[PDB]
Design a protein around this nucleic acid. Structure first.
Ligand SMILES: [Mg+2]
Ligand SMILES: [Mg+2]
Ligand SMILES: [Mg+2]
Ligand SMILES: [Mg+2]
Ligand SMILES: [Mg+2]
Ligand SMILES: [Mg+2]
Ligand SMILES: [Mg+2]
Ligand SMILES: [Mg+2]
Ligand SMILES: [Mg+2]
Ligand SMILES: [Mg+2]
Ligand SMILES: [Mg+2]
Ligand SMILES: [Mg+2]
Ligand SMILES: [Mg+2]
Ligand SMILES: [Mg+2]
Ligand SMILES: [Mg+2]
Ligand SMILES: [Mg+2]
Ligand SMILES: [Mg+2]
Ligand SMILES: [Mg+2]
Ligand SMILES: [Mg+2]
Ligand SMILES: [Mg+2]
Ligand SMILES: [Mg+2]
Ligand SMILES: [Mg+2]
Ligand SMILES: [Mg+2]
Ligand SMILES: [Mg+2]
Ligand SMILES: [Mg+2]
Ligand SMILES: [Mg+2]
Ligand SMILES: [Mg+2]
Ligand SMILES: [Mg+2]
Ligand SMILES: [Mg+2]
Ligand SMILES: [Mg+2]
Ligand SMILES: [Mg+2]
Ligand SMILES: [Mg+2]
Ligand SMILES: [Mg+2]
Ligand SMILES: [Mg+2]
Ligand SMILES: [Mg+2]
Ligand SMILES: [Mg+2]
Ligand SMILES: [Zn+2]
Lengths: 43, 101, 89, 119
RNA sequence: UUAUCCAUUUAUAGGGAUGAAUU
RNA sequence: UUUGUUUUGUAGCAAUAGUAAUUCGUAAUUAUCCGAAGUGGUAAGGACUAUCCUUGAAAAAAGGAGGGAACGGCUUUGUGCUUUGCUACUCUUAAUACUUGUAUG
RNA sequence: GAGAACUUUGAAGACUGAAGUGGAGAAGGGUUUCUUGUCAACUGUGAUUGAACAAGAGUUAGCCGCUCCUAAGGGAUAGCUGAAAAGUGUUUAAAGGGGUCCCCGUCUCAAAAGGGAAACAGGUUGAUAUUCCUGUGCCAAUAGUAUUAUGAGUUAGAUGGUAACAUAUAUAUAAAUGAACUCCUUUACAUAGGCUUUACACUCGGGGUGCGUUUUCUUUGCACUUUACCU
RNA sequence: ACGGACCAAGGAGUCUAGCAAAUGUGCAAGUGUAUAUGAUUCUUUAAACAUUUUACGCAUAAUUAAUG
RNA sequence: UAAAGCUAAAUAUAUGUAGGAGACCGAUAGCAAACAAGUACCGUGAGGGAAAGAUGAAAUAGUACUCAGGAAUGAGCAAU
RNA sequence: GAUGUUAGGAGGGCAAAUCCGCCGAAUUUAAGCAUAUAAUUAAGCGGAAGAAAAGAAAAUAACUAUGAUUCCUUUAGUAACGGCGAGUGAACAAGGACCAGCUCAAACGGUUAAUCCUUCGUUUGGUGCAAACCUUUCGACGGAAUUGUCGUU
């Protein structure tokens, strides 16, 4: 909830970062997305 | 009491421990930070996750003509520390903002 | 019983038995017991079993970069003395 | 953009000074990036590389100095020692392995395995 | 009794005739 | 220094803040903010009384007491101790200065 | 807006009805918060909405917690078992602290509801606030040496009060000698029952302000009339 | 009685060991060059070739619990 | 000639790395995995564990332009 | 004997196909099942190496005798074991691959431990661009050791 350990917080942040979509410019030279409600991080 | 004939491990390399450049990464824009700069002479800096308040203060002293009364910090969910730095009354954050950029 | 064995009882499922595990990063550190289910974390030993071949394969030496081991491979082939560069120019 | 061959000749203080300047420059670039700019965003990479180069040069100089300091003297720091697979380090030196009990040595000296061409 | 075993304690004076208590 | 009378103070915080108004301007002024009481819902405290073959945690931390160890400072002489001579001393907070790693969170 | 029963605003009519779809938190979730966009899919009807999609942003503490203490307990040290793995935790230990050699003495984790240094009000953001701002405090540190001041005491350690006990009001009650070694107390405690005291809530009547009713009636009905920690 | 809604693809007497019979083939009181060696053998060659300038198997004799 | 000890070779290798081969498999096959595969995802957990290859010679030919559409798309006398 | 953050070092964990120790089942087979079988297997625990282990006869033979170990061909599905059921089952010889032997202890040397190690050194060399290595013999100052080091066989 609203009191995390630092490690957990960092993990959450990491997950969030992972979430974001392919930078579109790359496509000129993703399947692991997760929606917070349907698939859990299972931490 | 130790008296080793030679020391075990001698890191001859330049220190890896974070200097001013590396500790404090960049100021924040964003409307919030701009507002802060305007109204209550608080400069917002993104910093390394392993910056302390003391350390941040030191960095600020070194990197700019800044004297800081108080520094609040927080760990952002992007893996950066955001340090809210309230300047002493002698300085105008706006002027210092201008100086930095 | 509204909190009966099925759905009602799944409502009372909060509170982790396992958390993250320093060492394995695998959310299988039994908090109350203070022991990782896939490591034996406090035991200085990895807790792997010949009866779990799949398990064995999914955490062996090859699986994950080998920061040092990889670097040392080829050295035998080269057989260069340590400390030695090539000739300049 | 400073490449290493220029930097080897420089003294350590000078190198340090250079490095600090480079770091400052990098910081400036970062600040610019943070602010709404993309003018010299691509300049940063080069600066970073330069910094790295400088660090490398300085580090090697330091290592050399250390080596000079600890030349011979039986024991040394474990850094400056022969970093080498643990087993090899443990292993008996070839000479040690060779070393023969005196009688055996004598025997070897007297009756060595001869060459003898059969016809 | 000395092996062995059990107990007891800070291993605290060898055997007999409703205060304080320390340098 | 104690008695009598009066004027203040929402005791300080405190009206500068809030609230409800009223205007005036393209943020400022003004006026208000106070005299009686009941109900006993909630909480806390108090003093008690009762029940138990149920008598209802511990420690960090703090305090108090008992006890009487130790005992001024400076100057001079001899091997921390003893002798000789003089009277501002022992505390105590607060500030200030200076070296000692940069002596506030 | 291309398009609206289910997007927005207003006007009605309703419901939740302080055991609330109201305010706060815990577990759990993890960015779902927020603004700007926005509609391929999803939002089992529609959809311009959205907890969807995209871009950015957002979480500020000496005082709120964790952090310290110990609890049921856990993991270990000594041993001792056991082929080991493990199993037991003073069972036959040479097991770090306190004073000026003596005297104590397993370690460590285990409470985000037990124990516990200290914070309140108002304001402010698109999104944070006992955390920022203004103001007002509080707590704990604060090394030595030297000056200053502040007061005590002595010309080596105050007095009062019959007593219960009281007294340092200096910016601020700071100071009333105290070692070893002891002994207490606080920490520190069940449930029930009523009784009482205070605050909060509610209400009543009066004064003051505004709004409401006004075919008729109503000195009227409603709102506001506030006051924190700290001393 | 059971299985079968439909369609596509996958989907079940195999491989080794040792024995036998059948049949083919070679040689025949022999037969099989077994390991291994050797070669002017070396993409194929992990095959093919060779057998030192009385090995062993099965057969050639049976029978007995056995000395035989 | 027990109750002490050492010792190369011929031997083994379904592990790892690197080579090389095949009367082997050819994307429901072959490793679970030809692809960001021990990945996603499920399970408190020990564990479980997928699907998913092919445009063309060349996208340095990946759909310009016009019309109708709110747009998707559609159409073309237009186009690679 | 404790004690040391004394000086110097070592162990710990990962990985396992082959390998070495333990520990150790049952499904299964026997048309049931109980000994047997599965199997001195799987799992478990520990430990090594490029291989490991074994190994230089307290061996086999009964010959005209061989001569460490290992491995292959065989002996041999034989001797033997076995509710003599199911089933299990070697060894020697023979032919090869490969072939390597040894040192402690004990005996002997006291007109003398000749040994051994730590630290500090000293000065000829060799390859290297350096870094490092490679060897060379010479003392000291320590210790260890007569409860036994070294040589001799
Ligand atoms: Mg949580
Ligand atoms: Mg859910
Ligand atoms: Mg904070
Ligand atoms: Mg539990
Ligand atoms: Mg006011
Ligand atoms: Mg709906
Ligand atoms: Mg209603
Ligand atoms: Mg109702
Ligand atoms: Mg939202
Ligand atoms: Mg729908
Ligand atoms: Mg929106
Ligand atoms: Mg989203
Ligand atoms: Mg607190
Ligand atoms: Mg503690
Ligand atoms: Mg306990
Ligand atoms: Mg235990
Ligand atoms: Mg604790
Ligand atoms: Mg608590
Ligand atoms: Mg909010
Ligand atoms: Mg039927
Ligand atoms: Mg049937
Ligand atoms: Mg049917
Ligand atoms: Mg069917
Ligand atoms: Mg035939
Ligand atoms: Mg022997
Ligand atoms: Mg051996
Ligand atoms: Mg496949
Ligand atoms: Mg190990
Ligand atoms: Mg059976
Ligand atoms: Mg059967
Ligand atoms: Mg049966
Ligand atoms: Mg096993
Ligand atoms: Mg060996
Ligand atoms: Mg054999
Ligand atoms: Mg036969
Ligand atoms: Mg058997
Ligand atoms: Zn683990």
């Amino acid at each position: 909830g609203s009191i995390k350990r630092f490690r957990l917080k960092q993990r959450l942040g990491k997950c969030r970062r992972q979430n974001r979509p392919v930078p579109h410019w790359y496509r000129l030279k993703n399947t692991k997305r997760r929606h917070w409600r349907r698939t859990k991080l299972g931490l | 009491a130790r008296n080793p004939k030679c020391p075990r491990i001698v890191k001859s390399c330049h220190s890896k421990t974070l200097d001013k450049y590396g500790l404090i990464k960049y100021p924040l824009t964003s409307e919030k930070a701009m507002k802060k700069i305007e109204e209550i002479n608080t400069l917002v800096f993104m910093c390394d996750k392993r910056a302390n308040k003391k350390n941040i203060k030191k960095s600020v002293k070194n990197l700019f003509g800044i004297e800081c009364d108080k520094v609040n910090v927080l760990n952002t969910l992007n893996g950066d520390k955001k340090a809210y730095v309230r300047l002493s009354g002698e300085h105008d954050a706006l002027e210092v903002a201008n100086k930095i950029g | 019983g509204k909190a009966g064995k099925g759905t009602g009882s799944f409502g009372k499922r909060n509170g982790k038995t396992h958390f993250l595990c320093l060492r394995c990063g695998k959310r299988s550190y039994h908090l109350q017991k203070k022991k990782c289910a896939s490591c034996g974390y406090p035991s200085a030993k990895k807790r792997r079993f010949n009866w779990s071949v799949k398990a064995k394969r999914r955490n062996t030496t090859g699986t994950g970069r080998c920061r040092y081991i990889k670097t040392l491979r080829r050295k035998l082939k080269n057989k260069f003395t340590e400390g030695s560069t090539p000739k300049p120019k | 953009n400073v490449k290493a061959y220029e930097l080897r000749t420089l003294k350590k203080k000078e190198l340090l000074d250079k490095l600090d300047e480079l770091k400052k420059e990098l910081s400036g670039l970062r600040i610019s990036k943070a602010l709404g700019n993309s003018a010299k965003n691509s300049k940063i990479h080069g600066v970073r590389k330069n910094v790295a180069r400088v660090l490398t040069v300085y580090n090697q100089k330091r290592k050399m100095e250390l080596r000079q300091l600890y030349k011979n003297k039986k024991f040394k720091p474990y850094n400056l020692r022969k970093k080498l697979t643990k087993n090899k380090r443990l292993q008996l030196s070839p000479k040690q392995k060779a070393a023969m009990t005196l009688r055996q040595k004598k025997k070897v000296q007297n009756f060595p395995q001869r060459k003898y061409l059969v016809v």
